[PDB]
């Protein structure tokens, strides 16, 4: 019934530095009047893609390159077993729109996501056309007719179906360009944050009369609000006509990661391996982000976490009652702060919440 | 009456500001003892007074327990007498002796250290009640002279 | 009715070790408001008037890098001297420019400590009072330029 | 079975100053909304590296230098019997990416950790290449082929395999680089801390009236939460294909140090030689930090320690039931209050805990 | 066999006018939750260093000065009968780093501790240097090896070998610098010292815990290479001092009746403080002293049991709440002198 | 003491991708002053000559239209080459003239991007330094007369 699935996460990290800019400063952001520490949507996405949870439950992430030479070498191995080389080379050339001659370096327009399965299927098609003495343009016309066939290859690589592809040069420009099923926001702190500075020393075992290096590093503890949206019809489309159950499956896997996954830097020196303290999931007709609950930057009372969850519940109550939303909602939390709006169904374990999303809000 | 007053910062910086600010609570004779100073809300103060203080816009009152005094001779009580000894007595012996002069007349001291005087004394009852009403020593309008009793 | 920067400099130089050191201890610039020696030092120079005091705060905090790291001589800018040191790397100056308010004063003081810089004090002083909008950009410009002549 | 091994430690120090900044202040950190006293991960790590326990049970630490001239002096000395001087120098020059020509001062790009065994193995390779008169790039290719050997040399310098190495210029920039199997957090106090300030006097035997020096020092007592994670697969890799048991061996060693080692400063004047009051170790699929148990800064009840352990345990219960993890977990403490629901095996002594980790739960 | 000798002392004495701070209050410390009375590490250190017992049992107190002028005068008297003045002055020059010799006042960089013995040793090395026409820097290079000798001269003045000494601008920075062998905590009361108002009585008798650690191998090293025995002697004299001494000479609360309030020593392989035995402030139960002792005992129990401590350990206690064991303090001093 | 237009042109061509891109991002000409690579690029060419920098700013900004829209060969006027593109409509040029100062440099850059013009660079550089009512007028006249030749 409802098309959008909203995922709200409240997660608190200990002192850390989870996103740096060119100056190795934390990534600041201002809301609505106060500095907040920010983790980029891109970091979140790649954290989830490159994650082991993903590899276990979704499959292979996509191959993102701007370098076509290396790509053609890879594809030559794998599909080299499956197809003729001349055919592979040509398939890459058509999709790319760039000329794949043996030369050391061949570069695409821009960094692009690739799926090997996809390319394999395209290779099948180019094999059929080449044997049948079909012209490239004619081939393009025929492939345009059934898009879904090209998109089921997406099922093999899902991150693309989630966050999308852009094309500028190839046959890819015509057929394989994809809108993201999932829209995600850079996570920000619920409260104001003034960044701490850690002053370090590198001690040189071979000089006694001093340190070998002196430096500074920005770092913060913070309670972050992560928000993400999955458009369901869009996800089904991008997979080539998959069912709501497959979609919801992917949606829960995303929920899990959204609650569980933390970007890698500089975790080896700061180790903010923190789990989500609050995970709330709602079905809706039109997407909704609860970030406005924290436009008034939350002031610490017994920590930032609790009054943040409080703020969240209260706002969601106001919004849901103001705009008369009646969508399926469930909330799982680690702390004993209870939700105000029934019906927000309370889940004792994340796995129960996840099973609830799979059953479509029951 | 025992009050728990907080004086605002702009009106408690100086000691005479403290005395005036606590004087202004009576639109209708008292003794005051400072618990904590220079908090963001100003001076945290325990206040003994003849009349009931009325909350000013500089000296807020948190509560007012009136008391009536039930003392028995022989009974052991903790005590904090914040006071000030002079003739300024720098020696420890001299301070303790001073205490046990006033209190020696009213009620024997069994233990004590230092000025805020913290200790245990044992008790004549009317003489002591009288002494608490009176206050003890110099600077009764400067924060000193307030003895508080506490039962064991 | 400006702040006589050189007068302040000499006053800082003339302080007793107890007060010079007492102020040197301050970690962040606003903590200067807790020291009486601060009030005493600033007092001739007009700290009594609001929107004189933020400037005075920054100026003193930069002097408190100690002990005499700021050495006075068209004029010589702070950016210039930071380059003339050659100890300081561009990236650090960048962090200074990019830095939020109190942190920026702190990192600056840290730089001063590191550079043992040879500036034109009242120039840098002025620059410090209006700090900083153009001033940040201006110091970047001066630093990169001086650093590139070399 | 499980790849990550988590180590949680609660340790209470008496008044002390275990980490200063350039201004000789304690290392603050704000969490969540309150000041906390901090000990930096670098400090803990170096404590452990330089520690006697490590020397005893792990082997040589690595030597971190930025000075290649001094370094070549050392290597020339130690390896001089094993290899020709010319070859030792060329090996250093290649690994470094700087030319080591007997010049007084030679400096690398950045401070770097070196292991004597590693440089030795490379010296061997450079010797064969030198005898066969094969070119450097080809050597580079061949060495790229079998990475594991260069990693097996790490067993001699394990601190590197644990915390990792980075390079920017040399042949090792291409060849010898490791991210590190263990991640460690700056230790934080469970509770808010307002630091005390001690005022020094230096009394001059030659002036009878005043003091010769007056000073100040920040210090606090604090209950600290230490956390560390060991990636086992990574550790095995970093040692050149070492066994799970070797990894666990190193892991137990870490648990011990983490429970035992305190940075040296300013210990001679404050003497916070405190043992851990709570040590907890759990195997899991994904690394987990219990720091969130103390985001609500713990309030003193009968001291900070007792409620710290309270916070920890209740929160552990909540996380464990909520995220449905069923990994091997054991806890050793001097004082429970506090019991976790018993999906944690309870070790009456640390040595038993260590034995439990060595045998993998 | 073991290297660290751990000294735990419970002492009872008034908490009034002992160690003051800048603002004339008694030095305090927060642990853990509650406010406690404090005697500073450095205050204990110098109390001992200047104490009588120390004068009769360990030696002369090293002299700590900033004014090299007065130092030059003192040295010219104590040496001018033994050494040529210009060599004395050159020696103070080299050693101190500051040029010499004449002015109204000459300062060093920081307050520096010295022993006139060490000085004299260097005066003799310098004499032989200038007589052999050796360059200063080669004198220094030679002086790099056999630091041990300059350390026997530290066997002359002992507190330096316990408290450590650090110099900056001088020759000793390069050659004669030494980190102390004993670590001492500040003394903290066992119990709270603010009452909370709106048996368990006592004031004017605090119970403080003092811990010191002696690094034996580092004592031997810091002296010329003294054997363990000498080191142990110094150690016992510190056990004594630590157990008995109070600033203002205000004898420990029971000094007419017992030698120590409570003492415990354990040889161990890594230093270990028992401060956490009182992080929960001890509550008064018939005084502070007894519940304090008992707190120390139980903590020591669980710690030793849990961390598997096979320490060479012995104790002197007065009260009867007890879980080795010595009948008198001096006998304990003996047991330490003898290494278990 | 003028600005060596051709040397500057070549200097911009020789820039690293990092800097070609770093300068191209700039929205208004003054933001160039926040870029260090700018100061590095310009400084030999007489930046640090106050009366030179406004000119230098404009030249760099127009080059900053990127990546290589401005391609060099009696001389070829900017107006002429803008017409020779045939992409640009007269009205737009009029608007370039009618806009106030900073706006006019911005708008021009937009035009340059669209036209991908073949000018005589040092000429365009001269016109660009002296940029003024007259110069503008000439831009119009050359444009219309050229667009009319065609």
From Swiss-Prot, chain B:
This is CRISPR system Cascade subunit CasE. Induction: Repressed by H-NS, activated by LeuO. Activated by the BaeSR two-component regulatory system, possibly due to envelope stress. Part of the casABCDE-ygbT-ygbF operon. Changing residue 19 to A: Loss of pre-crRNA cleavage. CRISPR (clustered regularly interspaced short palindromic repeat), is an adaptive immune system that provides protection against mobile genetic elements (viruses, transposable elements and conjugative plasmids). CRISPR clusters contain sequences complementary to antecedent mobile elements and target invading nucleic acids. CRISPR clusters are transcribed and processed into CRISPR RNA (crRNA). CasE is required to process the pre-crRNA into single repeat-spacer units, with an 8-nt 5'-repeat DNA tag that may help other proteins recognize the crRNA. This subunit alone will cleave pre-crRNA, as will CasCDE or CasCE; cleavage does not require divalent metals or ATP. CasCDE alone is also able to form R-loops. Partially inhibits the cleavage of Holliday junctions by YgbT (Cas1). Yields a 5'-hydroxy group and a 2',3'-cyclic phosphate terminus. The gene is casE. Does not require a metal cofactor. Disulfide bonds: none annotated. Its EC number is 3.1.-.-. Part of the Cascade ribonucleoprotein complex, with stoichiometry CasA(1),CasB(2),CasC(6),CasD(1),CasE(1)-crRNA(1). Interacts directly with crRNA, CasA, CasB and CasC. Stable subcomplexes of CasBCDE-crRNA and CasCDE-crRNA also form, both of which are able to bind target dsDNA, and CasCDE is able to form R-loops. CasCDE and CasCE complexes have endonuclease activity. Interacts with YgbT (Cas1). Binding of target ssRNA or dsDNA causes a conformational change in the Cascade complex. NCBIfam families: casE_Cse3. It is an enzyme of class 3 (hydrolase). GO terms for cellular component: protein-containing complex. One of its GO terms (biological process) is RNA processing.
Curated annotation (Swiss-Prot), chains C, F:
The keyword RNA-binding applies. Keywords: Antiviral defense, RNA-binding. Disruption phenotype: Loss of resistance to bacteriophage lambda infection, loss of plasmid silencing. Increased levels of 57 nucleotide crRNA and also 2 and 3 spacer-repeat units. Pfam families: CRISPR_Cse2. GO terms for cellular component: protein-containing complex. Induction: Repressed by H-NS, activated by LeuO. Activated by the BaeSR two-component regulatory system, possibly due to envelope stress. Part of the casABCDE-ygbT-ygbF operon. InterPro entries: CRISPR-assoc_prot_Cse2 (IPR013382), Cse2_sf (IPR038287). GO terms for molecular function: DNA binding; nucleic acid binding; RNA binding. GO terms for biological process: CRISPR-cas system; defense response to virus. It comes from the Bacteria. CRISPR (clustered regularly interspaced short palindromic repeat), is an adaptive immune system that provides protection against mobile genetic elements (viruses, transposable elements and conjugative plasmids). CRISPR clusters contain sequences complementary to antecedent mobile elements and target invading nucleic acids. CRISPR clusters are transcribed and processed into CRISPR RNA (crRNA). A component of Cascade, which participates in CRISPR interference, the third stage of CRISPR immunity. Cascade binds both crRNA and in a sequence-specific manner negatively supercoiled dsDNA target. This leads to the formation of an R-loop in which the crRNA binds the target DNA, displacing the noncomplementary strand. Cas3 is recruited to Cascade, nicks target DNA and then unwinds and cleaves the target, leading to DNA degradation and invader neutralization. Belongs to the CRISPR-associated CasB/Cse2 family. This is CRISPR system Cascade subunit CasB. It comes from Escherichia coli (strain K12). The lineage of its organism: Bacteria, Pseudomonadati, Pseudomonadota, Gammaproteobacteria, Enterobacterales.
UniProtKB/Swiss-Prot annotation, chain D:
Coiled coil: none annotated. The keyword RNA-binding applies. GO terms for molecular function: DNA/RNA hybrid binding; RNA binding. GO terms for biological process: CRISPR-cas system; defense response to virus. GO terms for cellular component: protein-containing complex. Part of the Cascade ribonucleoprotein complex, with stoichiometry CasA(1),CasB(2),CasC(6),CasD(1),CasE(1)-crRNA(1). The 6 CasC subunits make a helical stack forming a groove in which the crRNA lies. Interacts directly with all of the Cas subunits. Stable subcomplexes of CasBCDE-crRNA and CasCDE-crRNA also form, both of which are able to bind target dsDNA, and at least CasCDE is able to form R-loops. CasCDE and CasCE complexes have endonuclease activity. Interacts with YgbT (Cas1). Binding of target ssRNA or dsDNA causes a conformational change in the Cascade complex. This is CRISPR system Cascade subunit CasC. It comes from Escherichia coli (strain K12).
